[model samples]
Target: WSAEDKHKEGVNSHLWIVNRAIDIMSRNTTLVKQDRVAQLNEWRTELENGIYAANYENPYYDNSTFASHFYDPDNGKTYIPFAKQAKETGAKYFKLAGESYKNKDMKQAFFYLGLSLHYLGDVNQPMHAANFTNLSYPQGFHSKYENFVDTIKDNYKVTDGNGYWNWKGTNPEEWIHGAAVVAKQDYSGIVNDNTKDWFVKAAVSQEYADKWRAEVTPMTGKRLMDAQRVTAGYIQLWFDTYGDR
Candidate 1:
């Protein structure tokens, strides 16, 4: 909401989203030949390594931090000050993916794809989606919630039925913003029903943390499942738009 909540430091919660089970993105003649499933994992691997390799570990929060996080106040919402540089940066690499793919540069295409995917993946985190942290704290709550996601990140399965892919965004910003809007809608309800959407409750009390975690975890799991579905569609759309070159 403000220029910076220097006191509030949790982010990169998207790791929880990408690691979940999701379907392979739709394939077509224009897409690169390798398994999208393999590409997804490789994308995940680089990003996970990138955090430490690039020294994005918090305290620094690194470029990954800058590349993620956005605050938009629109569509029956309150004030938001800005966009995390990640949005634009993701846009940049997405453009590069188009160039690389068109040139038949498989390695470069995947490289850029992973970079953009990191930002796209980030919007799926409930806190990231709502532009709020799970804790209202200067000390521990923010990171605590991020770490909490880490614990159960892998407990979900690939949900069977198809997930809806309705966004009609044409580029990175529209897609990222739309994803955030949808994510925020769900996050707003979940947090409101449980804790009046108050970060303080989760931050300050053990009883609150226990209850909040019990309620929020499955909600996030389903969100992750949805991410898988939508991400695949987005990839399909991307190749469809630009791969013919």
Candidate 2:
């Protein structure tokens, strides 16, 4: 957690909420608090050094770890495998946890399962989901956006991250395809309602920047909240389907 990952320094900068999500979900009767907490810390630590994993291998996509982009052909939209990769990697960890479970190693199963949550946390960051870091925006708005969200931590009150408590176990091509499509739609909506070409082009005024922050603050909050809830849901699903045994 102390070291840095040059590539992902600013992006996915606020994963504390990832832990927060775990905290929120730990209250679930199905999960053991101490077990989940230990794994959550491990997950957060791994995510912090995401740029250079000790054992990283290629998945279907090049940017498997930082899967935070979507495509829209009409607007030349791009970046696939955003939330999709999270699902993939999350499932990968699920498999690892399953292997541990097979060996009757519950601790190792939880540890592996914990690794899966971080990717889902990244998807909650809107910037990860869309091409928001374009030339139109400021040099570091992406990091700043996440930083801002980090400050208003109380806004994220989502404990039901698992979504209806259903985790029938998971996917690959279908998830990458499905999640990316949903992220693209969500990203598109945010861009449409919150920004304009001119507004971003003229990133020179204090008043403009202030207004931009004010506008994006709530939007960012919602995404953060969503990230917490959805991540909680997924983690819960994984444990219920695998680790709980």
Candidate 3:
């Protein structure tokens, strides 16, 4: 995929994850009030902008864009734990959101929250959680899978039945780590040494794309659903921590 194409796909998937998370949260009227829902709806565009802008890397923080976004339990020597980075970064912005909320700056609060969610949403992808060598982006597995996912992302949504909302406290590190674990488990199904030809062809051939989609769609949807559940939990945690006061 071209850089532009990759950028667009990233924005689309991130925004989709965030919006669907809101939808899942909205199902519980007692959990999320109508007025708060309306506020989120009203701020949807800002949320998208936040997600869009999140694509830009903070030069001073990690300086590199991809390092902090990965977590590989099996290859800790080679890859950084995205769960660790997500915890630090997510908490930084979540706390910022809290500060903004305490100061009654709703827009700033949501904007920072959106920034925080971007990191959280990324590790839920199996490739992001696994060792880079496991699903080599330059070798076509990562791009092909994500591109195909972007094409069909809108078709899937998580209902309350499928969504998980039993958030106990504000800490997201364990939840984020759990997502990485789930993604890592599903990683082998998408790519392996035996799947080289399929991976290469899946990039340019419709036949391979069809087969790839069939094989990987279920896992993709599962991860996306998991992302929504974790996202809902953190969003509610943000509100409960800041808005409730």
Question: Can you give the TM-score per candidate against the true fold?
Answer: 0.66, 0.62, 0.81
- Which stretches of model 1 miss by more than 4 angstroms? 1-22, 26-68, 73-86, 133-139, 161-166, 190-208
Mind giving the per-residue lDDT tens digits that candidate 3 earns over 121-169? 7677777677653346447567667777887776678877334555544
Give the Cα error of residue 207 in candidate 1, in Å: 4.3
- Which candidate do you rate higher for lDDT, 2 or 3? 3
Provide the lDDT at 107 for model 3.
87
Each model's backbone clash number: 1, 5, 2
The residue-by-residue lDDT of candidate 1 on 105-144, one tens digit each, is 7666755665566666666655565555533322344456
Q: Order of candidates by lDDT, top first? A: 3, 1, 2
Go through the candidates in order and give the C-alpha RMSD of each one to the true structure.
6.8, 6.0, 3.8
Error of 3 at 92 (Å): 1.7
| Model 2 segments more than 4 A misplaced | 1-14, 29-87, 100-115, 131-141, 159-164, 167-183, 193-202
Clash pairs, candidate 1, are 67-86
lDDT of 2 by residue, 2-95 (tens): 0123234333333454555666666665544557556546554444433233114344234443332222322333344223434445457657
Model 2, position 143, has a per-residue lDDT of 48
